Amino acid sequence: DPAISMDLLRAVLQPSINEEIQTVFNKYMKFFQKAALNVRDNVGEEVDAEQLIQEACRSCLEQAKLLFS
């Protein structure tokens, strides 16, 4: 299955690609942190700021898939 061989290469490259993606996101993290703290500061204790930050980061990656449509 052609998708499987591609996937084996993908797995090989993932650790390097992850490291560079982390370095990219580190530059933006402060913006997400501030915005998520803002939400918590306005709404209250029942807002999990860390979870808002993580969801927003995962969404960015989801939307970045449109680079490869």
Add this chain to the structure above:
Amino acid sequence: DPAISMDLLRAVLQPSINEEIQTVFNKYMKFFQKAALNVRDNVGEEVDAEQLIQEACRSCLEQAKLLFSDELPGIK
């Protein structure tokens, strides 16, 4: 819902983040291109090499979501 402020920020940052992601993937693209051509050469004409490359790139982004989930493949 006030937490939609996260989405809006995200939409604002996306173009910049997308440019840097592209720059990252350009360094690895030659591996994916060679592998996809190898598959097409060894299976036949009905393999779309471009589509194999794209699907592998999207999978990379999917797996990169583990960086931001509650160990992780990395270079450190």
